[PDB]
Assembly symmetry: C2
Homo-oligomer: 132 residues x 2
C-alpha cells in the first residue's frame, strides 16, 4: 500500500521491577498540533514539550484518541500503522496507561516524536519500555 | 490488530536504480496448494517461474532500489479477503530470481514488522 515510508509500528512493553504484565490498557493519542505549538512557543525545547504533554494536567482533544490496546504475550501492547505525519508535520503520540488490574503499579505517560530517522523509514518498529 | 507488514528487498553487490514489482498471487497460490494437496514450497517454486503470467489487475506497487540497494514496500496487507496474503516479487527493469512470500502464521500474529528479502542471482 506504501511506495514511501508512511507508517510505523509501536510496541509498548509493560514489565515489572524480567516479568511481563498482560491485561494492562494503553491508549495512544495524536498530540502533533499541540506539541509543535508548544515547541514553537518555548523556542525549540523538545524535551520540555515532551515533559509538558506527559503531565496528567494535559487533557488531549477527545477526537485525538487513535487506538486502545491491552498488553498480551510478553507484556506487549501492539500499535500497528501509526502515521509518521499528521498533515505536513512529523507525527507526535502520547501513550497513557488508562486501565490496569489492581496491585499493578501505574506506568508514566510517554510522548514520542516521529523524528528524521523514522520519517526516512530506517525503523519498521519502535520498542517502548515505560518506567514507573 | 496486526493488519500490514513492511517488505524491503535488498539487491546487493548495493545496486540502486533497479525496479522491483510486487504482485498479489493469493488466489492462484491457494488454488495451486489446494490442487497439489498442501505442498507450500512446490506452489512457491511454481509461482516463482518465469512461465507464470500474473493477472494484470494483481500489480500492487513498482519501487526502485535506493540507499543500500533497498526497495521499500510499506503497508502490504497480511490478508487479501479472508485468506493469508501471498506476494510475488520480480525485477521488471544481472537479473535477480523471483520471490513468492506467504504471510504465514508468524506474520499474521504480528511478530515481524519488517521482512528483509535478499534475492539470489
Ligand atoms: Mg505500517
Amino acid at each position: 500500500a506504501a511506495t514511501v515510508p508512511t507508517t510505523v509500528d509501536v510496541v509498548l512493553h509493560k514489565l515489572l521491577f524480567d516479568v511481563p504484565l498482560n491485561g494492562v490498557t494503553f491508549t495512544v493519542y495524536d498530540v502533533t498540533a499541540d506539541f509543535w505549538q508548544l515547541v514553537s512557543k518555548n523556542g525549540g525545547a523538545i524535551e520540555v514539550a515532551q515533559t509538558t504533554l506527559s503531565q496528567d494536567s494535559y487533557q488531549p482533544a477527545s477526537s485525538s484518541l487513535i487506538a486502545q490496546v491491552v498488553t498480551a504475550g510478553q507484556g506487549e501492547a501492539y500499535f500497528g500503522d501509526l502515521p509518521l505525519r499528521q498533515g505536513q508535520h512529523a507525527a507526535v503520540y502520547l501513550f497513557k496507561e488508562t486501565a490496569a488490574p489492581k496491585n499493578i503499579e501505574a506506568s508514566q505517560n510517554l510522548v514520542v516524536v516521529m523524528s528524521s530517522n523514522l520519517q526516512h523509514g530506517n525503523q519498521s518498529r519502535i520498542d517502548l519500555f515505560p518506567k514507573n
